[PDB]
Tab-separated table of C-alpha atoms and ligand atoms in Angstrom:
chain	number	residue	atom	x	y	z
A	296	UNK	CA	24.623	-12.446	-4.996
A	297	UNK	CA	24.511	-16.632	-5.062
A	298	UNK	CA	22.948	-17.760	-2.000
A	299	UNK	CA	22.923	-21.593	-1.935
A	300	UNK	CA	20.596	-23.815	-0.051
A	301	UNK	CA	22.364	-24.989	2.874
A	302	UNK	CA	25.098	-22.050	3.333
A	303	UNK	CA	25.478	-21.079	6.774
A	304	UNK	CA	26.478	-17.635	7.647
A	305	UNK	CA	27.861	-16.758	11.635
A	306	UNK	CA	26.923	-19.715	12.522
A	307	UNK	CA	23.880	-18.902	13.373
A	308	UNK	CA	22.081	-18.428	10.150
A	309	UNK	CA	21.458	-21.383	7.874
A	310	UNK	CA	19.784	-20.392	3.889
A	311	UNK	CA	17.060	-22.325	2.851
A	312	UNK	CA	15.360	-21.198	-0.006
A	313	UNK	CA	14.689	-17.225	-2.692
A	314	UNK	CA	11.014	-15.898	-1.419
A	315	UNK	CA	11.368	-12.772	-3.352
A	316	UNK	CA	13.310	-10.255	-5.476
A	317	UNK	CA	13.192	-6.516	-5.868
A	318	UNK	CA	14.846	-4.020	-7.292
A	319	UNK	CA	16.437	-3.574	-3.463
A	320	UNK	CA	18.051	-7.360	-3.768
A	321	UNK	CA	16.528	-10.596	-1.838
A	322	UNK	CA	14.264	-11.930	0.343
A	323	UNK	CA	15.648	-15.737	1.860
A	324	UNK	CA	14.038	-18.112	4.243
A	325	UNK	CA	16.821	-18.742	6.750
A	326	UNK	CA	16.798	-20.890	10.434
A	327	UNK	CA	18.302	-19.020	13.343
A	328	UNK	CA	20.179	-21.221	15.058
A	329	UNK	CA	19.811	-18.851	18.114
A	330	UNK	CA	15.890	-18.249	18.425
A	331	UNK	CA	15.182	-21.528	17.277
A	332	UNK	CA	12.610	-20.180	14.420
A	333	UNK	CA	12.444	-19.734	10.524
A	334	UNK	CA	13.243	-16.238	9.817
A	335	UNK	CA	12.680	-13.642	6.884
A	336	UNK	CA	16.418	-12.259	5.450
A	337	UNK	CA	16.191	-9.361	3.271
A	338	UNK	CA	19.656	-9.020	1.699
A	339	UNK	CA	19.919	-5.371	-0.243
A	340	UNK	CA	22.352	-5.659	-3.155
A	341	UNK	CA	26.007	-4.217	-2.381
A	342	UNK	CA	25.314	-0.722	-4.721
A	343	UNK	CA	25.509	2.637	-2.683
A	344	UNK	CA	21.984	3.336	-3.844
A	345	UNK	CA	20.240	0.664	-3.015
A	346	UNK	CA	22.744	0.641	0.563
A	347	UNK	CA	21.718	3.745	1.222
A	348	UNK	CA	18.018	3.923	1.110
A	349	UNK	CA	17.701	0.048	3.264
A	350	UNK	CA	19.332	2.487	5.975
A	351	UNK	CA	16.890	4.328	5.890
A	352	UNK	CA	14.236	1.494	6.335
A	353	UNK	CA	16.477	0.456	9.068
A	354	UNK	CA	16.001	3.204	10.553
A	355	UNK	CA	12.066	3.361	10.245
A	356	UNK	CA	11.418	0.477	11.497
A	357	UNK	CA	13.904	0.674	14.868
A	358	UNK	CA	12.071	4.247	15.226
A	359	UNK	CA	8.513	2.123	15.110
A	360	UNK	CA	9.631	-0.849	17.169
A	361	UNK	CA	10.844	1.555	19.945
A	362	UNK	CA	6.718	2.383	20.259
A	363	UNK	CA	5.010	-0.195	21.685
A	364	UNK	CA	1.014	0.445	21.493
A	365	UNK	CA	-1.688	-1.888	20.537
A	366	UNK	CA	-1.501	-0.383	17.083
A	367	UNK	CA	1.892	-1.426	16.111
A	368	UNK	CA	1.739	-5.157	15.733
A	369	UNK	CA	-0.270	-4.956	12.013
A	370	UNK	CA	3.679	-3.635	10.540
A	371	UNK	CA	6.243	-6.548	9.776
A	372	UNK	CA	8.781	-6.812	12.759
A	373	UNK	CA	12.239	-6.385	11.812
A	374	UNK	CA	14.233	-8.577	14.404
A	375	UNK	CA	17.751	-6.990	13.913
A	376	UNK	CA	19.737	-6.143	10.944
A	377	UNK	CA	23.899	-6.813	10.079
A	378	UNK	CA	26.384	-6.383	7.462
A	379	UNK	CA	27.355	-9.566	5.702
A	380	UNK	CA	29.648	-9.627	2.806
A	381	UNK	CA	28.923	-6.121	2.012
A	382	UNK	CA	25.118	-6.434	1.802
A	383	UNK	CA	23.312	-4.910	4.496
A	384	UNK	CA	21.034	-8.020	6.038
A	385	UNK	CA	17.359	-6.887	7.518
A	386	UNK	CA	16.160	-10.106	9.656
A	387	UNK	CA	12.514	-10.529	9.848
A	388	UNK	CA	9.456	-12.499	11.191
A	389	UNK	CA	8.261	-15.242	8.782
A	390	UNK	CA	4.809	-13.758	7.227
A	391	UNK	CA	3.110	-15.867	3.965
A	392	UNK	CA	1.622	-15.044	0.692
A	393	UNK	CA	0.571	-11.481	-0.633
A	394	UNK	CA	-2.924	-10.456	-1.284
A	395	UNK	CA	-1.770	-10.162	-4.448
A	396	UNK	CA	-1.670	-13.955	-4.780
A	397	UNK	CA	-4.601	-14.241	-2.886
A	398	UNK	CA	-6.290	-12.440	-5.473
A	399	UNK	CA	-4.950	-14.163	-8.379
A	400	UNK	CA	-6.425	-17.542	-6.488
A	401	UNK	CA	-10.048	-16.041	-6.531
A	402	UNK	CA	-9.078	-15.692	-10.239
A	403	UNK	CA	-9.325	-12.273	-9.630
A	404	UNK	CA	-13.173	-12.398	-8.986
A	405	UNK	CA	-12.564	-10.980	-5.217
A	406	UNK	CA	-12.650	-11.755	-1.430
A	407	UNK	CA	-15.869	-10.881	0.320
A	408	UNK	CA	-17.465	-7.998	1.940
A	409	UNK	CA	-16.396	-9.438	4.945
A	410	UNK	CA	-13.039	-10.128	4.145
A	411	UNK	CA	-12.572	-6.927	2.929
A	412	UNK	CA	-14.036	-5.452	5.667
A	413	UNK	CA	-11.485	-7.548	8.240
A	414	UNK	CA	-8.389	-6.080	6.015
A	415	UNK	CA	-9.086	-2.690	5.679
A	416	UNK	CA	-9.695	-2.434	9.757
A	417	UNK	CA	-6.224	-4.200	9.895
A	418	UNK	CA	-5.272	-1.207	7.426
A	419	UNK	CA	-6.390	1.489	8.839
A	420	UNK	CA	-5.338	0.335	12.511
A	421	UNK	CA	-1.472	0.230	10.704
A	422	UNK	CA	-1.925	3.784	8.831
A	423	UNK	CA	-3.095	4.870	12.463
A	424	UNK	CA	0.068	4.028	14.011
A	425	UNK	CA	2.215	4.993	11.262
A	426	UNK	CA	0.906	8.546	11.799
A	427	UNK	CA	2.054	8.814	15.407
A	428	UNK	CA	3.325	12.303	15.570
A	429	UNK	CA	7.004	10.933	16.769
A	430	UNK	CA	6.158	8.471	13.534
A	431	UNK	CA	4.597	10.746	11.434
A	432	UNK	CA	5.566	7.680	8.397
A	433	UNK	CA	4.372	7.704	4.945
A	434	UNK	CA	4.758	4.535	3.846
A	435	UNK	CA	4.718	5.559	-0.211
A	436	UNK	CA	3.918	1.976	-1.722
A	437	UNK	CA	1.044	0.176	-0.546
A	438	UNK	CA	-0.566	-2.166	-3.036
A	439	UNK	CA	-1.307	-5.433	-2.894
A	440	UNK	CA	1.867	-6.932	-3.040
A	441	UNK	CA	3.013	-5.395	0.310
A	442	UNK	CA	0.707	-6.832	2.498
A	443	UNK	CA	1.159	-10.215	3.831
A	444	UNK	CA	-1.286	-12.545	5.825
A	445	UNK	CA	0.562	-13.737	9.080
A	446	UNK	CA	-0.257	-17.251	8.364
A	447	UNK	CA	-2.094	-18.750	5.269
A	448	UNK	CA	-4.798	-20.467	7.544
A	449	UNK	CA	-5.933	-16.899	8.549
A	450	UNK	CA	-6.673	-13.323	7.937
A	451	UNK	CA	-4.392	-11.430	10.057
A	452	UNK	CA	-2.140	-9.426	7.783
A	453	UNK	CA	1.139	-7.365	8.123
A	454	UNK	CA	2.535	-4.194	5.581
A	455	UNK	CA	5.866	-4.758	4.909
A	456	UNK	CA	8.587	-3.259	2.612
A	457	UNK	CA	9.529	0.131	4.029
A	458	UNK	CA	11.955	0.683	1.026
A	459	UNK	CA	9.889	3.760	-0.496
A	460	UNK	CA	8.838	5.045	2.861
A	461	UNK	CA	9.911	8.531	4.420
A	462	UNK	CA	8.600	10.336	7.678
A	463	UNK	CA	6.801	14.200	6.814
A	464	UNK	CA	9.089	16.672	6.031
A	465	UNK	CA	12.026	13.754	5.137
A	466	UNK	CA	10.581	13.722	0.871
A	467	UNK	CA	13.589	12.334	-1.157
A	468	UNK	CA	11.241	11.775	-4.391
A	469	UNK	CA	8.715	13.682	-6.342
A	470	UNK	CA	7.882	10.459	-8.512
A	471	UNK	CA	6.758	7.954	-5.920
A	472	UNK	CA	4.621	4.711	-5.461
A	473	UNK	CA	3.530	2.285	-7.670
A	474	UNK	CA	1.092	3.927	-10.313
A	475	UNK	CA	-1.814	2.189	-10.017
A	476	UNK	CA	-2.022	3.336	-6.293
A	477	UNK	CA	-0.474	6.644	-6.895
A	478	UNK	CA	-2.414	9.921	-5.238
A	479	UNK	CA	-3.712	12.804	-7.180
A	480	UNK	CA	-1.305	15.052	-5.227
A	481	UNK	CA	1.447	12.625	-6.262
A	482	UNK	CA	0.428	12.419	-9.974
A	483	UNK	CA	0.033	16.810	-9.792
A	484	UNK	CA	3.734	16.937	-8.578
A	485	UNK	CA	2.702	18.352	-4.645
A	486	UNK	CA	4.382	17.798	-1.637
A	487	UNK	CA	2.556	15.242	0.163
A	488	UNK	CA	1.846	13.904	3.313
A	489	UNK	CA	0.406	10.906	4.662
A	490	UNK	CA	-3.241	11.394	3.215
A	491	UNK	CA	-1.071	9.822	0.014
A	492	UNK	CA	-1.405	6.021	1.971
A	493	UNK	CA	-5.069	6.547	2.322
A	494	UNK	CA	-5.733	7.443	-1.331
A	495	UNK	CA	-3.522	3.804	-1.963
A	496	UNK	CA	-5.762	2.048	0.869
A	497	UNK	CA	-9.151	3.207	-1.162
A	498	UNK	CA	-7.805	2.065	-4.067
A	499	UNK	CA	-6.548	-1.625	-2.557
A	500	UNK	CA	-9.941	-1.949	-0.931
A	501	UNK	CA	-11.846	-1.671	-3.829
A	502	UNK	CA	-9.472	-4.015	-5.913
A	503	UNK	CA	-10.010	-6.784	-3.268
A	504	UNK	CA	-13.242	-6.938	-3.675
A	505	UNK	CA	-13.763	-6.591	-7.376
A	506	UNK	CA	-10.680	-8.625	-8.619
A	507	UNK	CA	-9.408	-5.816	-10.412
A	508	UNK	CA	-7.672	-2.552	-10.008
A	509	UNK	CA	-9.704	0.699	-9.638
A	510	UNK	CA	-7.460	2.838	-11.532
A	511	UNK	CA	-4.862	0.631	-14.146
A	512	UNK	CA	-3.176	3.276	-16.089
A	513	UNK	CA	-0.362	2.767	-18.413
A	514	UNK	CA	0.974	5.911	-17.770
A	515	UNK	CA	0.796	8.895	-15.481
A	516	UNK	CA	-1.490	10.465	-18.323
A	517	UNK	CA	-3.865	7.307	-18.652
A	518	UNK	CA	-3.633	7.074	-15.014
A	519	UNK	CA	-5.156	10.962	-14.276
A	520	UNK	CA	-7.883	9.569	-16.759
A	521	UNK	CA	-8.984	7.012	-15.075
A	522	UNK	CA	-8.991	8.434	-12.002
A	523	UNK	CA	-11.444	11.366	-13.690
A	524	UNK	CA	-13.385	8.947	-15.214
A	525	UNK	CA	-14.398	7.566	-11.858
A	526	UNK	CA	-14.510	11.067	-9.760
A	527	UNK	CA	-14.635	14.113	-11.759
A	528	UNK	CA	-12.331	16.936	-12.863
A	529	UNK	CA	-9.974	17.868	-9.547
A	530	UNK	CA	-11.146	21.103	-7.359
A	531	UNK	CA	-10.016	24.505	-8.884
A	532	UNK	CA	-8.136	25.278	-5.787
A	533	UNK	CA	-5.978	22.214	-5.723
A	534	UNK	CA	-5.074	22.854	-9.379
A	535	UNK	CA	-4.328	26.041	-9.029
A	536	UNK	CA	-1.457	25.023	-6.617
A	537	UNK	CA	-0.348	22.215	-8.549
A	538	UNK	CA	3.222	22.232	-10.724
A	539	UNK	CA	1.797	19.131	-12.918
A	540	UNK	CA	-1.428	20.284	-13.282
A	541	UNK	CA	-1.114	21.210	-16.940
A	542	UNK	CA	0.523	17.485	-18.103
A	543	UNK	CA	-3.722	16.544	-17.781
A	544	UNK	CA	-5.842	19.675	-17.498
A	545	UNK	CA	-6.270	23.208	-19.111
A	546	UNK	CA	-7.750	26.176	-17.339
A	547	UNK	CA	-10.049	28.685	-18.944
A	548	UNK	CA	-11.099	32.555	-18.537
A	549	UNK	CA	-13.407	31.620	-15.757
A	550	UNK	CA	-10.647	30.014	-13.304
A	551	UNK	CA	-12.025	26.727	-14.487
A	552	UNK	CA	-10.689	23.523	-15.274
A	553	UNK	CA	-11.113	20.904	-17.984
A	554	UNK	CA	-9.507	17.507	-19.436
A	555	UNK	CA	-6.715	18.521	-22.128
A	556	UNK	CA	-8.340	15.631	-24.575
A	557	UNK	CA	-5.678	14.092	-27.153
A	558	UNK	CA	-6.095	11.360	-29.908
A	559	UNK	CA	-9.359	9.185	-29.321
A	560	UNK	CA	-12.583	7.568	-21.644
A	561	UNK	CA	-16.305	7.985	-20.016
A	562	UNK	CA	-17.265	11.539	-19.369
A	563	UNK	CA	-15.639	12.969	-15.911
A	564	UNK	CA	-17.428	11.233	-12.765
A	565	UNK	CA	-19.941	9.320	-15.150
A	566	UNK	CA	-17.405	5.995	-14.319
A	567	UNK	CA	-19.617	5.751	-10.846
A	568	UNK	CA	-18.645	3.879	-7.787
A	569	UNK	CA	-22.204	2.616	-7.304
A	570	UNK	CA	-21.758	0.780	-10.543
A	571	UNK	CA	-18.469	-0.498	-10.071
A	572	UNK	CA	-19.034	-2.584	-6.787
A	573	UNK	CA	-22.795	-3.002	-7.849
A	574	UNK	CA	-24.341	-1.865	-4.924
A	575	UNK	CA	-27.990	-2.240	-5.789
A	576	UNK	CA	-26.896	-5.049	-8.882
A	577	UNK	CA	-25.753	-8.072	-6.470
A	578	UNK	CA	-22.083	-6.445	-6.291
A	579	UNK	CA	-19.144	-6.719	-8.851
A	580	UNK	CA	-20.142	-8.761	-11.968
A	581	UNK	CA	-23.568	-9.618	-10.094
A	582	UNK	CA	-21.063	-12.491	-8.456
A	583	UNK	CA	-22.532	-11.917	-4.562
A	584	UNK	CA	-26.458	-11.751	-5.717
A	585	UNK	CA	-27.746	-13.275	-2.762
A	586	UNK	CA	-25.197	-14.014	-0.753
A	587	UNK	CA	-24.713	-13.057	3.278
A	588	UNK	CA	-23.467	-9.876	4.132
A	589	UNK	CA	-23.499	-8.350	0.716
A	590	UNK	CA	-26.886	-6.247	1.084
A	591	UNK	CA	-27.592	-2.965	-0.053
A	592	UNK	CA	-26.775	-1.368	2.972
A	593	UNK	CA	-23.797	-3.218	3.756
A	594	UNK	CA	-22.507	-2.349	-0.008
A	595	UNK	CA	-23.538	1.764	1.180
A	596	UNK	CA	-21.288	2.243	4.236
A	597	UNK	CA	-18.565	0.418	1.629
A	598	UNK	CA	-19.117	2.817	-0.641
A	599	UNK	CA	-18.961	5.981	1.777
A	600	UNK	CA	-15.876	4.785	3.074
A	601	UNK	CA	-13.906	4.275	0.071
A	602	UNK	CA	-15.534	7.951	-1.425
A	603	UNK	CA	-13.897	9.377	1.552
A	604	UNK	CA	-10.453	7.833	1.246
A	605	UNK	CA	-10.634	9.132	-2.555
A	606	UNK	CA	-10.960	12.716	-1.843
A	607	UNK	CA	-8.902	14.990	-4.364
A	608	UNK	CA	-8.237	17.232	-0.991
A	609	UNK	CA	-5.465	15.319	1.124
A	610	UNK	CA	-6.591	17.897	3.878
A	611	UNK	CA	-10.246	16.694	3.768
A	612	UNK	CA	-9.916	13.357	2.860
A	613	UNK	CA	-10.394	10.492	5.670
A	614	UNK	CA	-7.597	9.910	8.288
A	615	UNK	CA	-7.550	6.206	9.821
A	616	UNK	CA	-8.792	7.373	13.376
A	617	UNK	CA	-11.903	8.245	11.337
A	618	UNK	CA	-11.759	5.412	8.854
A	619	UNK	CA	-12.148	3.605	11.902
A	620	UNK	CA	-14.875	5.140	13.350
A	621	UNK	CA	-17.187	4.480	9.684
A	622	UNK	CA	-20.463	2.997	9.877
A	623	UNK	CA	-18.664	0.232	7.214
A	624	UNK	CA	-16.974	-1.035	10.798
A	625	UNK	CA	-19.566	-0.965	13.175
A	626	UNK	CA	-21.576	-4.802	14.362
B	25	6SD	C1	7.602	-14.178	3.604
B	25	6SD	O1	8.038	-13.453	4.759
B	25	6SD	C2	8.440	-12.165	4.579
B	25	6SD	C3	8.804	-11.442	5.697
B	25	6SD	C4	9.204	-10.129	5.549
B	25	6SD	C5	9.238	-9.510	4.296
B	25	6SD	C6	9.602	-8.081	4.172
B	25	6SD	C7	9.804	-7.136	5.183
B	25	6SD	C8	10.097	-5.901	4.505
B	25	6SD	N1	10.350	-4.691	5.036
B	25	6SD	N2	10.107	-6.181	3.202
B	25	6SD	N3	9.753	-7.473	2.967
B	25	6SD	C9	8.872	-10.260	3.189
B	25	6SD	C10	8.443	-11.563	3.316
């Protein structure tokens, strides 16, 4: 769909300017005439697939804003939502730039301990709400790219783009969110829950501080790779229940497991944590040697945290009341 600057649709909605593209369709800056305010328009291309599964993010996001607890303001509001020229129309709050792009203006070297430490509380306060029982919403995509700040003076940010996202027991999709970010249950072919967000959130956290992603594989196979590289071979008895388990690993007489090796990654759980954010070596690339905030005890509680949301066991691993409680968040 052409959208020129300038159209005005209903009269009440007048097009300003593209802010995005997706595989869903289009993101336009638009003035409501009505509330007197700049507004985010998400316009889903007119396809019965891509129709179909904005309905569903209509309906997520009525079923949060019909919740109203302290915890549900760090989700992007959806105002209302219409059908214009056959494109179903999702009206949002104005948010501004990614962390993706704030990363790429640190030239990927990373945001602080502290600023790290402000988004994942902001996070985990969102993945709190999200699983409400009544919720009960896996979001399925977090990265980067899907968090906003509220306003580019500040450091208040906002998850948005529910396209992906399902409540338990809803799954459409075996092969789900973006790979970098993707869960070990995910990867193994499991049913999953909301422990898969988490897993994404450990992940982000870690990338915002280094510059870079934790985990960048190429391909699901790379991907399970990397991840062992960092944490070990998977527990026995999440393998054993696992329908992918053979695309990486092999079992032996013993009920053990091991890395199927092809064609020449460090040895499993060598790739260590400690190393990577450089706890005791003035953080990543030695870059905060010195600096406030960035001690070795401060860089500990980091590390516990993220160690927890990285558990192979989504039963085990941290859940965001918990995250919240972590030494990493307390003055
Ligand atoms: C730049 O302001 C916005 C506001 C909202 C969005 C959004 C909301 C959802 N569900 N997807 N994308 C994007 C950008």
């Amino acid at each position: 769909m052409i959208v020129k600057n300038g159209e005005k649709w209903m009269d009440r909605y007048e097009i300003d300017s593209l802010i995005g593209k997706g595989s869903f369709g289009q993101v336009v800056k638009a003035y409501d005439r009505v509330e007197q305010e700049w507004v985010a328009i998400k316009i889903i291309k007119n396809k019965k697939a891509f129709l179909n599964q904005a309905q569903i993010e209509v309906r997520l996001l009525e079923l949060m804003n019909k919740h109203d607890t302290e915890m549900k303001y760090y989700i992007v509001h959806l105002k209302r939502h219409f059908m214009f020229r056959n494109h179903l129309c999702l009206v949002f709050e104005m948010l501004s730039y990614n962390l993706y792009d704030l990363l790429r203006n640190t030239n990927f070297r990373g945001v602080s301990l502290n600023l790290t430490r402000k988004f994942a509380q902001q996070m985990c306060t969102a993945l709190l709400f999200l699983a409400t029982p009544e919720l009960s919403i896996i979001h399925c995509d977090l990265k980067p790219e899907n968090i906003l700040l509220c306003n580019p003076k500040r450091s208040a940010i906002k998850i948005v783009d529910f396209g992906s996202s399902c409540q338990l027991g809803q799954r459409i999709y075996q092969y789900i969110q973006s790979r970098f970010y993707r869960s070990p249950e995910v990867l193994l072919g499991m049913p999953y829950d909301l422990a898969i967000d988490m897993w994404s959130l450990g992940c982000i956290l870690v990338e915002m501080h280094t510059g870079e992603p934790l985990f960048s594989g190429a391909n699901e196979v790379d991907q399970m790779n990397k991840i062992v590289e960092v944490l070990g071979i998977p527990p026995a008895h999440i393998l054993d229940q696992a329908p992918k388990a053979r695309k990486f690993f092999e079992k032996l007489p013993d009920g053990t497991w091991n890395l199927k090796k092809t064609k020449d990654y460090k040895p499993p759980g060598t790739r260590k944590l400690h190393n990577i954010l450089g706890v005791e070596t003035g953080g990543p690339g030695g870059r905060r040697a010195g600096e406030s905030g960035h001690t070795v005890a401060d860089y500990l509680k980091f590390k516990d945290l993220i160690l927890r949301m990285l558990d192979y066991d989504p039963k085990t691993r941290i859940q965001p009341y918990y995250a919240l409680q972590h030494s990493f968040f307390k003055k």
